[PDB]
Design an enzyme around this catalytic site. Structure first.
Site, PDB file in Angstrom:
ATOM      1  N   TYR A 473       0.892  -1.156   0.000  1.00 24.36           N
ATOM      2  CA  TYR A 473       0.000   0.000   0.000  1.00 24.36           C
ATOM      3  C   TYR A 473       0.936   1.213   0.000  1.00 24.36           C
ATOM      4  O   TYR A 473       1.206   1.806  -1.049  1.00 24.36           O
ATOM      5  CB  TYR A 473      -0.936  -0.040   1.223  1.00 24.36           C
ATOM      6  CG  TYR A 473      -1.967   1.068   1.256  1.00 24.36           C
ATOM      7  CD1 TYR A 473      -3.082   1.030   0.428  1.00 24.36           C
ATOM      8  CD2 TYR A 473      -1.824   2.153   2.121  1.00 24.36           C
ATOM      9  CE1 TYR A 473      -4.043   2.032   0.470  1.00 24.36           C
ATOM     10  CE2 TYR A 473      -2.786   3.167   2.170  1.00 24.36           C
ATOM     11  CZ  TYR A 473      -3.886   3.107   1.334  1.00 24.36           C
ATOM     12  OH  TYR A 473      -4.837   4.113   1.367  1.00 24.36           O
ATOM     13  N   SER A 554      -6.388   0.949  -4.325  1.00 23.65           N
ATOM     14  CA  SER A 554      -6.516   2.374  -4.032  1.00 23.65           C
ATOM     15  C   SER A 554      -5.130   3.020  -4.149  1.00 23.65           C
ATOM     16  O   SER A 554      -4.533   2.995  -5.224  1.00 23.65           O
ATOM     17  CB  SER A 554      -7.117   2.549  -2.639  1.00 23.65           C
ATOM     18  OG  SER A 554      -7.781   3.786  -2.554  1.00 23.65           O
ATOM     19  N   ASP A 641     -17.843   3.292  -7.508  1.00 20.66           N
ATOM     20  CA  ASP A 641     -16.695   3.648  -6.681  1.00 20.66           C
ATOM     21  C   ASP A 641     -16.541   5.164  -6.657  1.00 20.66           C
ATOM     22  O   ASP A 641     -15.810   5.749  -7.463  1.00 20.66           O
ATOM     23  CB  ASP A 641     -15.391   2.987  -7.163  1.00 20.66           C
ATOM     24  CG  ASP A 641     -14.208   3.269  -6.227  1.00 20.66           C
ATOM     25  OD1 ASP A 641     -14.344   4.098  -5.301  1.00 20.66           O
ATOM     26  OD2 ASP A 641     -13.145   2.638  -6.396  1.00 20.66           O
ATOM     27  N   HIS A 680     -15.852   1.156  -3.895  1.00 20.41           N
ATOM     28  CA  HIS A 680     -14.448   1.043  -3.514  1.00 20.41           C
ATOM     29  C   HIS A 680     -14.088  -0.285  -2.867  1.00 20.41           C
ATOM     30  O   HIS A 680     -12.952  -0.726  -2.959  1.00 20.41           O
ATOM     31  CB  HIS A 680     -14.061   2.187  -2.586  1.00 20.41           C
ATOM     32  CG  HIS A 680     -12.602   2.520  -2.626  1.00 20.41           C
ATOM     33  ND1 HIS A 680     -11.942   2.836  -3.796  1.00 20.41           N
ATOM     34  CD2 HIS A 680     -11.684   2.601  -1.637  1.00 20.41           C
ATOM     35  CE1 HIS A 680     -10.676   3.099  -3.521  1.00 20.41           C
ATOM     36  NE2 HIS A 680     -10.495   2.967  -2.220  1.00 20.41           N
TER      37      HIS A 680
END
Length: 710
Positions: A473, A554, A641, A680
């Protein structure tokens, strides 16, 4: 292996914009309109080729079947008491949404309190936030449809689970806090806007306000308690102090762990809540985080990062507010991050630390901050907890890479704090004893040592022959800790894979310095860190470039997409989920303006200079060497999303297919899948979650030609 043809996508060559002198062409800018016939046709055409590709090989069905089998296990949340009743979430195994149960006693028969499954046939209506009244007799809950961040707040009377008529609309990124008098509840709402507000629009969200809803009245009657007309991006959330005397307003602007802290002594309101409250601006700047833990009279205990990157506990007396007067209750640890703190049984504090990406849990004295008890845990994460100030017991959930987890219980009224297993589920089919997790620290480009967990079957020879799945991430102060994933374990057991999670900079694993090491001008550090993780796995013999798959979602989608552009030679497969791809325009849509604290904003010349160098959409380029092509890529997004608008992935895939997909040397597929009635990721129903992982691993299997191991 490419039996399909990429869709025809019009290029608007006139779409050129000037960014501080730098001309940027955006030929697919029209894809920013989700409602046009052109964009609809584009989505249809893309899905037309992706689905048959994912479903051609029998292995998708094998994976789906195994996933449906293994994921079918009872999943519970910690019990938590509200008033005279206990509540807990529970999924029998394959229900689309977990159900909220209630019981009048710990030994009592439990009954269904709130079942979201009956709200939709496909499970696309999910609970998003909730708040019980102080006395536990009333309940407010948010509902989101099709995965959108938009919420509709509804109410119920607990006794008899009675539905009430109160409904609140235009709610998003909202607080939910009942005043202790039981009259009403604070929440946030956005002003009316033209167009849709269902999660398919891209409209920027500004001017969020704080309202107070009196139970039994229409929303039109709600009281406006706080607004920031001159600061459109400020968002103020309210919470009541434990004694119900003060409303605490935490004002945020952006995603940094900092907030303004204003308070209101309800006793001092001229005549109850009738308008803008008499806010006292205790902390009136965004220099530090002030997270309320508890208070004793005017002495308020806050978890903060003010002058403490690893976090600590301080006491601020409202009667002697100056910073020089604050008392440090629990000093900052030299290295361990204090993740969260809870006050329970009046004078106990539960502190959860992160030690080298593993959680620890302990009990401290409120008055002195002294350590009283250490709750033993294996290597893993604490993902659930219950125990408020008036409670006399705690429940906490532990999970790890190899085991579903255990919910522990500890009666705090006993002299001997003896924590005991309350609930423990095991997944028959996976023998945790056959696998092992190791933590290593590899040096990044600049020499910084980065932690990485690697999960694999015991006794594998490090000859570089195994397929690997590397996850990351890197951003927003988020720590990627051990979690139980049946989907990843199937990759290990049935696909002979090796799992790896790299704790790259930008995250919160080592406090705010770790976070700052991967943001703004230093965002490239994230990418370097991740690329070095892949290099480590390869050098040490865990995998090879052609057998390596990277995944992220993301901000993590941005991660893997950038890595594909920067080092296409290092990966065999890339799966980017709901990723931010247009780094020059992300701030224009929905809540994107909030991410500028991590990325910066293209409106600034300095920031544009950082951004343009890594923006996925603006760095697609054919590898110079004839022997190097782009890895196989799969972008996953959905039409609702509204967190990271789909246009990011639509524009990115159009670019990839045109620039790279057209080259003769490109044999690896570059595909996108746009799901319907999904967003999302939060609240996504079990059915969709299973379909998604089946798509992901089927993609990996076909692209790398991996045989299923029964």
């Amino acid at each position: 292996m490419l039996s399909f043809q990429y869709p025809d996508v019009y290029r608007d060559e006139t779409a050129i914009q000037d960014y501080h002198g730098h001309k940027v062409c955006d030929p697919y800018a029209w894809l920013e309109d989700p409602d046009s016939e052109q964009t609809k046709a584009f989505v249809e055409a893309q899905n037309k080729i992706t689905v048959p590709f994912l479903e051609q090989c029998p292995i998708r069905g094998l994976y789906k079947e195994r996933m449906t089998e293994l994921y079918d296990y009872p999943k519970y949340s910690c019990h938590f008491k509200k008033g005279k009743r206990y509540f807990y979430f529970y999924n029998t195994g394959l229900q689309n949404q977990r159900v909220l149960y209630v019981q009048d006693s710990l030994e009592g028969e439990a009954r269904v309190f709130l079942d979201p499954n009956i709200l939709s046939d496909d499970g696309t209506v999910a609970l998003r936030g909730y708040a019980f009244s102080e006395d536990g007799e009333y309940f407010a809950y948010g509902l989101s449809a099709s995965g959108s961040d938009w919420v509709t707040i509804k109410f119920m009377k607990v006794d008899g689970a009675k539905e009430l008529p109160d409904v609140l609309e235009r709610v998003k990124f909202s607080c939910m806090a009942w005043t202790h008098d039981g009259k009403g509840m604070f929440y946030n709402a956005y002003p009316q806007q033209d167009g849709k507000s269902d999660g398919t629009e891209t409209s920027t969200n500004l001017h969020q306000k704080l309202y107070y809803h009196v139970l039994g009245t229409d929303q039109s009657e709600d009281i406006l308690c706080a607004e920031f007309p001159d600061e459109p991006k400020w968002m103020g959330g309210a919470e009541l102090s434990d004694d119900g005397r003060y409303v605490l307003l935490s004002i945020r602007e952006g995603c940094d762990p900092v907030n303004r802290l204003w308070y209101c002594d309800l006793q001092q309101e001229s005549n109850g809540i009738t308008g803008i409250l008499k806010w006292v601006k205790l902390i009136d700047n965004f220099e530090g985080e002030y997270d309320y833990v508890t208070n004793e009279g005017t002495v308020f205990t806050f978890k903060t990062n003010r002058h403490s990157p690893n976090y600590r506990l301080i006491n601020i007396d409202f009667t002697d507010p100056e910073e020089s007067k604050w008392k440090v209750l629990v000093p900052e640890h030299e290295k361990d991050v204090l993740e969260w703190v809870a006050c329970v049984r009046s004078n106990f504090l539960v502190l959860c630390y992160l030690h080298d990406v593993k959680n620890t849990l302990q009990l401290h004295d409120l008055a002195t901050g002294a350590l009283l008890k250490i709750f033993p845990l294996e290597v893993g994460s604490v993902v659930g907890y219950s125990g408020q100030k008036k409670d006399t017991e705690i429940f906490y959930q532990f999970t790890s890479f190899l085991s579903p987890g255990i919910i522990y219980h500890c009666d705090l009224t006993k002299e001997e704090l003896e924590p005991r297993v309350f609930r423990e589920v095991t997944v028959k089919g996976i023998d945790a004893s056959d696998y092992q997790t190791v933590q290593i620290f590899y040096p990044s480009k600049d020499g910084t040592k980065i932690p990485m967990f690697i999960v694999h079957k015991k006794g594998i020879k490090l000859d570089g022959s195994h397929p690997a799945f590397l996850y990351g991430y890197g951003g927003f102060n988020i720590s990627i800790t051990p979690n139980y994933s049946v989907s990843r374990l199937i990759f290990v057991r049935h696909m002979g894979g090796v799992l790896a999670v790299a704790n790259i900079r930008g995250g919160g694993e080592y406090g705010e310095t770790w976070h700052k090491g991967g943001i703004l001008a230093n965002k490239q550090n994230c990418f370097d860190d991740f690329q070095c993780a892949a290099e480590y796995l390869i050098k040490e013999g865990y995998t090879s470039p052609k057998r390596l798959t990277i995944n992220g979602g993301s901000n993590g989608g941005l991660l893997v997409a950038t890595c594909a552009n920067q080092r296409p030679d290092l990966f065999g497969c890339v799966i980017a989920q709901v990723g931010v791809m247009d780094m020059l325009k992300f701030h224009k849509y929905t809540i994107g303006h909030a991410w500028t604290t991590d990325y910066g904003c293209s409106d600034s010349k300095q920031h544009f200079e950082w951004l343009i160098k890594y923006s996925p959409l603006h760095n697609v380029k054919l590898p110079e060497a004839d022997d190097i092509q782009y890895p196989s890529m799969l972008l996953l997004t959905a039409d609702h999303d509204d967190r990271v608008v789909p246009l990011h992935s639509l524009k990115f895939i159009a670019t990839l297919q045109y620039i790279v997909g057209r080259s003769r040397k490109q044999n690896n597929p570059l595909l996108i899948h746009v799901d319907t009635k999904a967003g999302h990721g939060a609240g996504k129903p079990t059915a969709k979650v299973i379909e998604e992982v089946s798509d992901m691993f089927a993609f990996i299997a076909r692209c790398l030609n991996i045989d299923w191991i029964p």
